[PDB]
């Protein structure tokens, strides 16, 4: 697989810190990764969170980085949900572009305990 | 907004030719677009169908181009489901990439009658 992620199923309580990982294997100095999010409930378009690379990090306009941040270390990309909100529940995943193809990591689901 | 799509809800019968459209709105520059798909059931990662641009079109490895194809005409991008199958039901959308940011169109749902 192109990506290796941290456990795909996560339970978090309100206010907890959640840390997600996607490793892009077989990488180079140009390797970049974008964190995306999809809401629970009805199917709806993904939301861009941030783009990470050695030379440039770019967060989405309107992203509150006090609650959601991320970083690159070597070939690992991380997303941190600092103070888990009810509306932070959903599906997080990485996206990587190579030769005109968009690649996606498996979903990492993060939900409150039922 | 950045995208305009054909009707977001489509009802189709088996064997019907279904044609979807996403228009990239403020084309200041040259535009490109990738057609993506999400399965209707359990939430899981989107599937890349094809990338469309002036200088390169790229279909996903494995894509049956006899059932699914697409093209670019100026800032309009189209996806054609040539002979609608049960397995073609689901959610279709576009993304484009600009200045390290991924943008997505609204979802277009295509389903058989109840």
Residue numbers in the entry:
A (entry chain A), B (entry chain B): 1 to 114
Lines from the paper:
CD8 is expressed on the T-cell surface as dimers in two isoforms, the CD8αα homodimer and the CD8αβ heterodimer; both consist of an extracellular immunoglobulin variable (IgV) domain, a stalk region, a transmembrane domain and a cytoplasmic tail. Here, we report the high-resolution crystal structures of chicken, swine and bovine CD8α and confirm that they are capable of forming homodimers. All of them are CD8αα homodimers, and each CD8α exhibited a typical IgV architecture consisting of two anti-parallel sheets.
Three extracellular Ig-like domains of chicken, swine and bovine CD8α (cCD8α, sCD8α and bCD8α) were crystallized and diffracted to 2.0 Å, 1.8 Å and 1.8 Å, respectively. The sheets of CD8α are composed of 10 β strands, but there are 11 β strands in sCD8α and bCD8α because their A and G strands are divided into two separate parts. The two artiodactyl CD8αα dimers also have some distinct structural characteristics, and the most notable feature is that they have an additional A’ strand. The two artiodactyl sCD8αα can be discriminated from each other by certain characteristics, such as the longer A’ strand and shorter complementarity determining region 2 (CDR2) loop in sCD8αα. The buried surface areas (BSAs) of cCD8αα, sCD8αα, bCD8αα, mouse CD8αα (mCD8αα), rhesus macaque CD8αα (rCD8αα) and human CD8αα (hCD8αα) are 828.3 Å2, 979.6 Å2, 928.7 Å2, 1048.7 Å2, 1105.5 Å2 and 1026.3 Å2, respectively, indicating that they are tightly binding dimers. The BSAs of sCD8αα and bCD8αα are similar, but there are six hydrogen bonds in sCD8αα and only two hydrogen bonds in bCD8αα, indicating that CD8α dimerization does not mainly rely on hydrogen bonds. Especially for chicken, the four conserved aromatic residues contribute 161 VDW and 262.21 Å2 BSA, which account for 42% and 34% of the total VDW and BSA, respectively. These four aromatic residues can interact with each other; for example, F48 contacts F104 in sCD8αα as well as in other CD8αα. The numbers of residues composing the cCD8αα, sCD8αα and bCD8αα cavities are 7, 7 and 9, and their volumes are 202.0 Å3, 322.9 Å3 and 384.6 Å3, respectively.
